[model samples]
Structures are given as C-alpha cells and as structure tokens.
Target chain A: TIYKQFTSRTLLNFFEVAALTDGETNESVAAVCKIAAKDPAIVGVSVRPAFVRFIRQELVKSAPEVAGIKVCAAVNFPEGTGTPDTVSLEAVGALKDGADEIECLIDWRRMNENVADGESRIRLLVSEVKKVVGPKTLKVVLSGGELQGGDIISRAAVAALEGGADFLQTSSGLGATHATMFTVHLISIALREYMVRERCIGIKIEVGDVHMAETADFLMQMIFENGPRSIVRDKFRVGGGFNLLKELRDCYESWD
Target chain B: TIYKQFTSRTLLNFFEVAALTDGETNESVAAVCKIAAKDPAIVGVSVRPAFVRFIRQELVKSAPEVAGIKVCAAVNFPEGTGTPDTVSLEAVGALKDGADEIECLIDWRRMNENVADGESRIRLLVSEVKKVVGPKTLKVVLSGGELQGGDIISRAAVAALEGGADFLQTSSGLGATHATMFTVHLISIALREYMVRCIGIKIEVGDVHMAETADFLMQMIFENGPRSIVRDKFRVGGGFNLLKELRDCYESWDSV
Candidate 1:
C-alpha cells in the first residue's frame, strides 16, 4: 500500500538533496549517498564538480543496488560568469567523473538585459555542455528569484527551455532567495506554453531548498492545477528534498 | 567627534560590506561601489573578479577623493579546492582588475585531517598567491566554522600566517557556520604566539553575515582580543542588504 501510495516514478522522482555547503567534505558525500541508497523514494544528490568523482565512487561502492538515484553537480555554480570554455569544461569533466546530471547557471544578468541574445547564450551553453555530457540530464538554473517579475521569470524559463535545458531550475540555494511558489507558478506557465508550441513532452521544472513537506505538497498541487497531467515527477523535481523525504512519504501515504 | 568615537582602527577595518550575492548584476555592482566610494570608514567592497574592473572604474569616477577603501575579491570562492596555479592565476587576475585585496579559501578539510600537510598545502597556496599579488593584502579563509576544535583553528591560523597570509579569515558566507567569538579568541591566541616568535606586528580577522551580531562581536573583540589587534585588521562582510544595514547601524549609533 505504501509503495502504491508513494510511487517512485512520481513522489520519489521529485526530490533531491544537495551537499553544496562550503563545509561539505568527502565524508559528507559518502554519508549522503549512503542515505540515498536506502531511500528508493528519493531522487539523488547534488554537489559541486570537485566532489563528483569521489561521490560517484562512494555511491557505486556503497549503494550498488540504488539504480535511478543520480549524482548531480553544478558548473560555474551559484554564478554563471565563468567563460563559456570553462563552464563547458567543468560540466564535461563532471560527467566524465560519473555525474548523471549537470546543473548549469545561466548568466541571468545577461538574460534579464537582452532576452534575445540571452536566449542565444543559454542555447550555446546548453549545446556545448550537452555535447560533452551526451544523454546526461542538463538542468539550466535561471536563478528565478534573482529576476524581477513573473514576466521575466517566464521569459527566462522559455529561454532556458529553448536553449535545450532538460529542466529549468529556480535557484542555486547559494543566494539569499530560494525557490518560491510564485517563481514556480511562472515557470509552470512558461512550461505549459512551451509544451503547446514546441510539442515538448518531457521538459521538467526543478526547485532548490524546499525544506518543508507542506511546501512540497503545495508545489505538486500547484503543478497539477496549472498544467497538463504530464507535469508529474518526470517533469517536477524538488532540490534539497531530502530534508522532507520522510514527511513527504508520510504525507502521500495519508493521501492514499 | 562621532567619527572619532567609532574610529577604532580594527572596528572600522572589520566593517567590510560585501556585494557577493548570487544575483548581483552590473547595476548592483555600480550602486555598491558608489556607496563604498563615499564611505571611507567602510573599509572595502568584495565582489567577483568579473565586476572588479567596472567597480574600480566607478570608484575612480564617482569618488576620486575617496581612497584607502580596498576592492577585494575571492579566489576559488566559498570553496577552496582550486589548484595552486589556478588560485594564483585568479588572484593575479583580480589584482590586475583593480582588486586591492584577495580572499582565498584554505582547503580546511585537508587541514582538519592532517594539520601538518594541511598547513604545508596552505603555506604553498598562500605563498604562491602572495607571489602573484605582490604587496596586495592576502586573506586566507579557513572556513573556521568548519574546523572542529580550537587547537585545529589555531594551527591553521599559524600555517596560514607562516605561509605568508596577511589576514586569517573565518567564513566565506557560503557555509552554515560563521565566525564566532570563540574562534576569534583561538585565532588571537595563535596570533599572539606567532608574533612573539617572529616579531610579527599585525594580524587580521574577517567574517560575514553580521547583523546585530556585528555589534556584539565587535564589542567582544575590543574587550578581550589582543591589544595589537586594532580595528584596521578586522574585516566583516555579508550578503545582500548588508551594506545598507551596516550603514544604518553606523548612522543610528552616531545619533545615539
């Protein structure tokens, strides 16, 4: 009943935890992977590129049975000002080090100023990183909280989607702003439009620092209310979801 | 008289406000530099290297009379995992971009594990970065909150000092832990010992995210820290709205 109520494809897939604090060490990566290994209803772990190799190795050694859980890393993280070459190199390097997902920060400042050129820049960056990572998932972070209004958030989301982002993420969690419901609403609107216009089916929306179970529930409810039935876990992820994994599981089980 | 009353060399030096948020744009950078240029007691403005040139230009244009407020930037920021060559290159680049100070993260994890080799690694990093920056101030951030014990913190401080760091910084504002009075006291102990042996005359302590905590910490340091640890050698920095908050604090204190 618990399994039926809390499906891995939906509830579990929507959650991810990040070991991105400055104090994070190799031990923390191992610990997170170990915990994630036991929780099938959890998505995966996110970390900086420098820790990808060790984290991947730990996940392989300690969580060999854990299949879908990914090892995600950020490139030119928190900020996206690194030269294109550097960002691309870092993303490729992380993939080579065994990262299943690469989250890249879009130059939001550039995007906010010149949407046309900004879209082009995001496209180029995504293309380059995607070229190296191949089939690996690439999440383009718009720092939605950093942008001005709902219009800007929607525009940036569209730009990132057009640029080949598999998921348009809300924030880097390194900033003062975290993923908010308002930003998620804007993103869902953009995704809905993109899906209708581009015939896109699998585009996803990811958010960081969703520390509360109630917030996770609210996000899912909002997603269902605003968009297509296809906007499920396959297209919705909660970054920093490990904090609420048990609560989310409990919440969903009660719903059933 | 108000300036004179608040003008403890270490207190003024410690009151550095940063523009190091994730969403910082060029416009934000200009605004920060404008305020910093007009406030001599504010110490410095910390920014990414990308904005250093523009900020430097702005300070020169808007406040030519304002001098001594250093332009500081971070290397391998928040995280200190960059190779020695990479860190050195970045610091040199910042200096060239008009940054008067370089804040470098010392790989605290390594130091916490093997203090001897960690110290050696830190010495190597500081020495190399110092070589590139020449006479510019080099502050080595220990991520003091991450280090476990007083003994470890003191040792790291000595390692950094021995390796040629001009200041030993406490946090990168990216960590959950912050510079605390206890950590500062440990660092002070290390500074006292180092100075006695080497005839060293100056030591600096830096941290971030100071709000009301700023006043409390400043009072603690003034009351209990070593006699030579003047306000000129203390640096405080923070994320968004910190500059305005700090300025407000100064104004309100002056009114009192």
Candidate 2:
C-alpha cells in the first residue's frame, strides 16, 4: 500500500484539443477555441486547415492579444495534401497569424509505400517550415491503427524524426481506429532505438483519442521505459475530446 | 500450377488422440490408431496425457512409425501439476520427450474461467491430437489444456455428431495459447465443421497446412454464410508439428 504514496503524485499528462469537423461554422470554431482557452486543464487546440483559414481570421479580429494557451493549426490536417511550398506557406501563415504549434498529417500514400518522392516531399515540408518557425514545435501525425504490423508505424516515426518533427503523433482519430498500445509502443520503441543510435534529443511521442485509460497508461509506461530518459510533459501528451477530464479525475482519485 | 496438384493430394486431415497415461496404454490409445494408419502426409505428433502413466513410451516408441515426421510432447502434461506426476499425482510432469507436437504448458487453472469443464476437457485433448497429426492422423494427450475454452475447442465439433471423430484426437497444439482460427480451420473447419456438428455426409473442406483464412472464407461461402454446414469424411487435431507442415504447404493447398 506504500506504493500508493509513491504513485499518488504520478502527475499523468493530458492535453485538450478542439476538433473542427468539415461542416462546422466559423463562429462555432471561434466559440470552441474561446471555451477551450478558458478551461484550466485545457492545454491546446488542433484545428483543421479549413478552420485555420476561416475561424483564425475571427480569432485575430475578436481577441488579438491572447497568449499562453498554444494554438495548433494543421498543415495537411485531416486530408494530407498540397505541395511542400503550399503547406509551408499555410504553416507560416498560421504562425504569422498566431499559431504556436503546427500539426501536419503525412501523405498516407507516400508513407505506406516508402517512395523516395514521399521522403523528399516530407523533408521539404519540414525544412521549409523550420526556416520560418525557427525551431518551433512541429507535431507530425502518422494516422495510426490502420496499419497491421508495427514495422510500418516504426518507419513512420523515423520519417517524422528525420523530417525534423518535434513530436510524432499517433493518429487523427477520425479514421478506422485511434491510438492503441501496440502502435504507441511500436513508435516509442522505434523512436527510442533511433534516438539512441543517433544521439539526438527533444522529439516527443504523442497519442490521440485513446478511449481506454489503461491503454494510455501502458503507452506512457512503454514511452518512459524505452526512452533514454523519462518523457517530459512537453514530450508526451494525450489528445482527447470527451471523458478525458473524467478519466483524469478518476486517475487522480485512484492515485491517492 | 502443376506443383499445386501434388501438394493438394499430400494434405490429409490430421487427428490428435488424447492418450490417457493410465498405466498400460488403455484401449487401443489414440496414438496407436494414428501411427498404424497408412498416410504419408500425416506430418505431426503431440503427446500429453491424463492419469500420468507411460507418456514417454507412447510418444518415443510410436512416433518412429512415421520417420522424418515431426513430434510434439507436453511437459507438465495434463492438469499442470507443479512437480513430476510420477513422484506424486499432483506434480506436473516435466519429462523432456523429443516430440515435434508439443502441447505442453497451458494454464489449466484458467481453463474453466476462460472456457469449459472436465468431459469437455477430454474432448479438447481429442481435438488437439487431430491438429498435431496433420491431415493423416493424430493422437490427443489430455494434459490440462482441457479447461473451458478447450471445451469449446473440443466439443465445438465432435460432440455434436454421433461417431463424430474419424479417429478422435486432442489438445489445440497450443495448450498455453487457446486454439486460434489458424489451427481450427485446418483441423475443424476443413472438415466441414463436422467435428462441431454432424456425422460423415459432408464435402470435405480444404487440404491441411494451408492458410486458415482461405479455408474459413471457403467454408463461409460453402455454407452459404454464417450458418453451420456439415458433412464429414475428414478428421481434425492439434499441436505445432502439424502447423509446420501446414506452413510448408500453404502456398499450394487450395479448397474447391
């Protein structure tokens, strides 16, 4: 039971991100972001490219001087598209407008096939954005759960790392399935191994919409165990919509 | 495609017979029937038992009948005893018999919790014997793999029909891992679900040692959907030795 004392302050990490469906109105997006910013536990917001272009104008127009809570705008967003230049410009525009973080989805076709053209495409996107953001945090989404084996997930992690992504995200949470322990563990193991070999640092692992708390705990355990050091709060985050706060509350209560 | 024809005929229904180790090999034990049968493709052998008697004699002496063929024998055979059963009936036997069909190391205590009961346990031993024996013949040696899921794995077929077993067999090859689709499709599904449903009046399914998914799909189509269809001239059994053969010839075996 003394173990409870040690685990009580475990400090489980969580991040709230406002999701904008393709059909949502600009006012709805702005209202969501405003409410998200007000929640003490809410850390950030991940909005689609369309919302970034539309509601972003409203954010700057309605409340221009807001800060502290990070605004994460998407490059590829739900649909992975656009040339490297176009994506980079969109990211830069979001940064110039007010986005503190950029979350981009990889081209599924390219990542699935390991095409040279795909590698070049991502490399160019990362390099171009790095020039504008000046080492600002970039989260590259691999869109997990669809891939059958762990090997592909690991390769995606490598590609994100090689492309200079500050964080490797598990999924968009809209597809066939979301974050699973297997995918997270595979990505974490791959990243840990790669980091050890390369002696590189700072890239974090993030997972989205993992329904089960046990799964999140498992991933967190694997991430910590497989890493060179413990994964930091900035390095690890759970991207969720509903029941997240409840789950966190339960985790805290159980921790005591 | 010419190579395919020979491979197809080579596949036979494997049967695992659970040889009760009740002192002197009781009543024309499952192993004797499988070994005496004149089938060249009968490629595997598993030995586990109930009542802890001469398992080594049953496995070592009888297995040579099919030369170059694989054999599997269980350690802690039947009932998961903690020590050698010979010293005390409660002790789980750990004798290392050189078997190619190993159905040892299952958590019998977790049996009823996961699946079935005692008589059902005996039936599973029969099914397992079928799996290891390949498409030709098999012997089921009931160790503790006979819990609840084992009951489902066992009576899932044979118990449903009178004279259900062509030769009656045991263990799902993996006492530890519950019988998976890959194992059952070869042992049970290929037999037209006969083991689970009826007596011999069915169209025998696929050749042994091919992909189970293919067999399952074929059965799905053959039965016209989710409904159970039966006709039996074939048998089913368990163990890893048969799996190897199935793996070896998977590319060539096809169901019509």
Candidate 3:
C-alpha cells in the first residue's frame, strides 16, 4: 500500500492523440486495465469519449485489476469549441455510453462571448449535461493552463460549480500547459468556497507538460491537506499517462 | 552549412514560467545568445516582450556571439487574452524597446464576436499593430493549438495576412498544443496561398508537446521543400527551449 494512497487517488488516463502514436485502441485499453490491476490504489481510468463504452465492456469491467476504478471519458475533448447544444449532446452521448464519469473541456469559444453571454453559455453547457448525467460524476476541464490562467480558471470554476460540475479540472492535459500547483491551489480555493455550499465538486489536475505522477500525487495531497475535510477526502483526483506506469514501477520497487 | 540551415532557422526560446525553472532572465538571455554564437543557423533569440530591450543592451546584442541574431519579443504572450488596443500597444512597446521582431497573440476573444465582427476584430487587432510596426517583422500568433485548431488557425491566418502581418505563427508555445507537423503544414499551405505574391510572409511553428528539434527542423524543411521556390526559401522558423540546447550539443557534434 506504499503507493496505494497515491494510486487510489489517480485516474490513469489515455485520451486523444493526433499522430499515429498512442491513439487509444483495444490493446491500449487492455494495457491500462492490466496496470490498474497491479495496484488497488488506482481509482479510475480515463479515456476519450469514444472508448468509455469500450472500457465498460466485460473484458475491462470484469477484470479484477480495476474493480475499484471508475471509467472517465472526455466530451468535446482537447478542444472546447463546440456550442452548448453540441457539447451537451457530446456529454449526453458519453453518459449514455456507460461512462461512470465524463470530463468536458468547457467551450473556450465562450470566452469570446461577452461576459454574461459567455458565462451563461458555459453554465448552460454544464447544466444541460448535468440534468441528464443524473448523479454520475462530471468534470468540467477549464483548460486554463494559459499564462493568464487565473482569470479564466477562476471564472470557469465559479460558473461550472453553479451549473453542477462534480469536478473542476485544470488544463486539458493535451495543451502546451498542464496543471500546476498554483492552478491546483486556485481550484482548491474555489472548491472549498463552492463545497461550503461534491460528493458534488472537487479538483482534478491533468498533469501538464510536467509528467511526474508523484508530483501529481503531491498536488492532490496539497488539496486534501488544505481543503475542508468533507469535500476533499474522496473528491479530488488527477489524470496522467506517459509517466503513469513509469512512476508505478519505481513506486513498487520502493514499497518496502 | 549542414545543420546551419536548421539552426539559422530556429529561435532559441525562453518564456514565461510559473515555476523557478526556465524563466527568462538576464543570465538566461546571455546564455541563449552565447549558444546562438556557436552557429549562424541560429536566427533569433525570443524573449518575453519585457526583455527585448535588455537583450538590445551592449553586453549581449553587441557581443560577437549573436551578431546574426534578432531580438524577438512576444506581446500578450502565452495566454493571448489581451484586447486589441492592449496587444497593439504591447507590440508598439516591444518595437520601441528594440525588438527586431514582435509577435502578438491574436486576442482569442475575437472568436466570440459575431462572425464578421470576429473577423474584423482579429483583422483590426493585427492591422493596428502592423501600422505601427512599420518594416520590422510582425508575426501574429494564431495560437491555434487546440484540437479543433484547424478552424481558428486557418481563420486567423487569413485575417492576419489580410491585416498585413508579415508572418503567421502556429500555436503559442505555452499552450497545451504546440505546433504539430499537421499544424505547421496547415499554416504552410496557408502561407503558399497567401504568398504567391516574402521576405514579407512565412510560417513559424512553436514545437508542440512533441519536442524533437529534428522533427521541428524537418517540419520547416517540409514547408520549405513543398512551397513555391520564391516564397519558401528563407521564410519559415520554429521556437523551442527545453531541448534547444539539448539538441544543439548533439547538433554541433554532427556538424561537419
């Protein structure tokens, strides 16, 4: 259980890929599930929307390795350009396809919308999906890994919470920027304020260009340590790949 | 001449970082310029807009190491959320402060403008800066590094060219998406279409998450190799930092 604390809080992830490399396939899903099997700490496996159903199939679902793991899929994905109707549809489709949880990149184009219009558009995008998602977890990815992330990330946190997001995710994980401790802290502050109202909402950091799973675990602990106990204990999670297994092997070696 | 062709076309870059690592500083600039001295292949040393003037100082600018290098500064960088007036002012400020070239992030907010308005807004943003930048190189960063980057990037390229931008840069290096071959190729296609008419126009690829200097070099080569002979030669560039020096050492070893 040495790395279990870290593993249990992690959402092992594989999502969109442009080049021929790393595109999710049956082989990749089985591989991820196999890794999750090696540790009981892994809490979830993240895949693109297209594969959520695939992940739910007997092969992975019945596998003993990831019994504690949930299946998370992304809607709108690395890009958040879809309009409300479209994004909502994307979310609904993911939920319908057996995604235990769905993550959506907020329509960044909404930022181009006037303040109120943008706010409402984002809120509507989340709620429209929320109503149908029922109690299933929904993470709204802010993709706020920009230099001026403070502005968009904070605003999206407020709006997404109001619209009922189950998690506030920092960065799309595919951009040049990924989650930072500061970004995580930013969302945690927001999450505490909002939860003061997830069981409903927590923070999820997709490791940015910095790919250390241990770093991600520390970031999650940073939140767990700082936030109101009830909201954060089981709420915050992180998604990472590349170094996910790379870290796992070393973690096991040092378990003693 | 072997790798000089690639080096002369590359921009040794260091930009905004939230952490202690790799933030551009006086010493860092001197270091980058020193590396630039090693090869005529190095073209520009890119800095955050604030440092262009510092780079212009006699210590580095006047040093023999970077005699062939230009000082390129980014305006409203990394995030690109600046308003047109602000971005234009940023460009003007960089130019006045001795930047040989200034790159501005197109206020991504323009995408929210109603159709023609968004087009006009992006065009106006570029033209306002173009008017003041005069003959100095003005590269408008489209930052179309999103998964659906095809739409915004293609649109921004058209608007920037119409607005008189001298170059179209693909992706803000700090975003989750940096330049991919497809993205560089996308802009190269746009460049050819626009430059059938310079020295006046080109494509700039900021290495995406895939950070291979060799890949970036080949991308520039792909553009150079495919375009009309007149517009293609000496027209494209790329920016990378983390692996910039890492690649350079080996690059030097291979130099004949």
Candidate 4:
C-alpha cells in the first residue's frame, strides 16, 4: 500500500498516452492534454507523430503554463518496419514540431534476425534519433510482445541503451502481446546488468498496457523489487491508457 | 449473475487456444487439451497447425472417450498473408492431419485495399478452404485488430459468412490490437444482419482475447443483448487464453 502512496507521490512521471490510432482528432488530443493538466501527478502525454503539432498547441493553450505536461511522439509506431532513414526523418520532424520526447519502435524483425547486426542497427537508429532528440528523452521500444526469447529481450535492451536510449520500453501496446510483468521483468533484469557496468546512464524503464489501477501498483512493486529508488523516483514511467490516470487516481484514494 | 450462470451452462461452446508462437512444445499442447478435456463445458481446443496431430493423439489417449474435445488448427495463422493457394494447401493439410476444425486468418492487407475486390477475394479463400474443411467447422478470422473501420469489419464479416465460413472470427490474437468489446459487438451486429435472410447456415461467432472472467462474462452479456438463445445455445464461442476456463469456473462457483 505504501508503494501505491510512493507511486502517487511521484505520479508526475506517470506518462498518459492515447493508444496508437490513425484518426486522432484535435478534440480528443485536447481532451487528453486537458486531463493531464488537471492532474498534477501526470505530466507526460503522448500521441501519434502526426498529432505532435496539435498536442503541442493544446499544451500551450489548454494546460497550465506552469505545470506543463511533456509531449512524446511515437515514431514508426508499433510497426517498427521502417528503415533508419524514414524513421529518423520522422523523429527529427516530431522534435521540431515541439515534442519533448520521441518514443520509437525498434526493428524487431531485422534485429531478431541477427544479434550482432541487431546491436549495430539499434545503435544506428537510437544514435541517429538521439542526434535530433539531443538533450531530450529517447525511448526505444523493443516491442517485447513481438519479440521472443529472454536472450533477445536482454540483448535488445542492452543494445538500445548502448545505442543511447534514455529509456527502454516494453512494447508499442499495439503488438500481439501487450506489456506483461514477464516482459517488464526481462527488461528490468536487462537494465540491472547494463546499469552495473554503466552506472551513470540514468536510463529509465517504461512498460505499456497498464490498464487497471492494481496493475499499476503491481508494476511499481515489481520495479522497486529489482528497481532501485534511483530509477523509480523521477525516471520510472508507465504508459497508461486513456483512463488509466482515473483508474490509478481512484486506486490511490481507496488505499488510504 | 444470471448471464454468468447461463454462460457457464453452455461453456462447452467456449474455445481454448494457445496464442501464436514459434515454440509450442508437446507438453504445453497436451496440458491445454487435458485442461479442456477435464471441463465438459469446454469442447474446443486449438493449437498451431504444426501441433494438430499431437493434439489429436493426446485427445484420444488422455481425454475422456465420449467427451471428444475438438482440436482446431490455425492455418496461415495470425499472419494470413499467404495467397489462396498456399493458405488452401495448409488448410487441407491441417484437416487431413486430424484437425476437427480450421481457424484461418484472412489476408487483411489485400482485402483492405479495395472493397469489391476484398469481398471477391475473401469468398475465394474461404470457399477453397471450406471445401477441404467440408462437414467440419471452418472459422475465417477477420483479424479485426489489423483491419480498421466499422465498414471494413462489417464487410469482412459478411464476406466470410457468404464464403461458407461456419464461424466468423475476430482476430488471430497475434495482431497489434487484441479483440475488444467493440470489435466483437461489430461482428455480432454483422452476424445479426447476415442471419436475417439466410437463417439456415447456422454460422457461429467468436471473439479473441477473452482474458479476464469479467471479460468473458461481459462478452456473454453483450452477445446475448443482441444475440439470441438460438446462437448462444451451441454455436457461440470465445477464444480464451491459457487459464480462462479455470478462471470462468472459479467465477461461476464463486457466484453461488
């Protein structure tokens, strides 16, 4: 229960993003930003790459000027099928359009094809996008749901970090399997090893498809179990659904 | 509560299947079938096409003689990108290998490209597979998670039924999106109209990703809201994950 309290305390790091959709409207984007603005706990919001501009405008107009929720745009989204060229192009464009973060999906297929090649390709993608996202956050999605094997997940996480990912995400939430505790567990374990070697990276961990409030609490407990407070304090985040904040808010209130 | 009771009674109509994977061991398939065979309420079990013969042998040796749990094979599986020729080949092979039913995913991209052509192509694929699957059930997965729009889903469902599908499936459970209530609602509503003029076909309806007990209960409720007892009695099914039947049993017993 204290974990819920702790999570709620730093809930500002809790990222609230709309699920990937091609038809996100300005009205819905504003509504999402408005909800984020209403909750001081939630300061992160994401939308499709196309809506980066609209969400940015909403942030300026609808959100409290001071609280200022951050915007993260999905690049190559759940597909992760794009070449480095097209994806980096979109990444830079999203950043230019006023996105504070870029959450890009990794090419799981190609990466899965060969580990050595995967690490190389991951480095290129993350480093290239990192160029445009300089001094900003870059969350590289391993698409764990799409990828198989503990070895692959571990390698991908390490590779992404080695490639310069500020955060290692579990999935796009649009994958065949949404983020599960096991997937997150693998990523966390992978991060632990990476952190052991490279202590100053301050790499964050995020898991997707956190629908229920109980789910959020459980994630916090798991992360803290293997995840130190160093990461959980301000760097840890969960990509919640449209109403995840409401569900979490209700859960937090009930715990007391 | 009444709906939960009703669903429990006809739970044999429920389908249990393993999600798509490159590594499904004999141990897992036998365990899934053994679980299904224990509950007389669940009569259907599916595995990857590669496991059809294994499941069939397990059913005969491990399951009750008369309980006769059906084994369904996934052909072209969650991908569904194969041509009618390749898909049909796998469909026939799976049937001859001792599958009681064949659940095949549609080529959503090709079908999504053009409406008229989509319907025509859907008919060809379903019809060809139906011939091999004759006298047994043939479920044509619309992959609603992959296909967008109310229009495309509606068209896909109707076209599958017209193509001699014994059941219209929502998705392969390996798509970017899992089956939501909205997707099922669309399929049921689509089924409602298709049954209007052609009442003799007795086509079944199945929605994938019925993960939680409440999810199964909600689906039972929603299906019955527009769905009639005629369909719910024996033809209705939901593709459940690993522990759904146990979860439902617990929910059913708890209610009393």
Clashes of each: 9, 63, 16, 2
B28-66: candidate 1 lDDT, tens digit per residue: 876766665554346677776777887766556765643
**C-alpha lDDT of all candidate models, in order:** 0.64, 0.47, 0.59, 0.63
For model 3, the superposed segments whose C-alpha errors exceed 4 Å read A1-22, A61-68, A144-148, A196-199, A209-217, A220-225, A228-233, B1-256
Residue B154 error for model 3, in Å?
73
Per-residue C-alpha lDDT of model 1 across residues A60-166, encoded as one tens digit per residue? 67657444578888887767877678898998788888888888887777766787877778777776777776766788887733646667667778877876778
Q: Give the residue spans of candidate 2 off by over 4 A.
A: A1-13, A30-35, A50-66, A114-117, A144-148, A199-212, A222-224, A227-229, A246-256, B1-256
Kindly list the per-residue Cα lDDT of model 3 for residues B51-147, writing each as its tens digit: 7767676645357665556777777776667777888787788888777877777766566455466668778878888887888878777763455
Output the TM-score of candidate 2. Answer: 0.42
What are the runs in model 4 whose C-alpha is more than 4 Å off? A1-13, A62-67, A144-147, A199-210, A221-228, A231-234, A251-256, B1-256
- Candidate 1: DockQ? 0.01
DockQ for each numbered candidate: 0.01, 0.01, 0.01, 0.01
Q: How accurate locally is residue A250 in candidate 2, as Cα lDDT from 0 to 100? A: 48
lDDT of 4 by residue, A182-232 (tens): 666777777777778762343333444455544444344443335323334
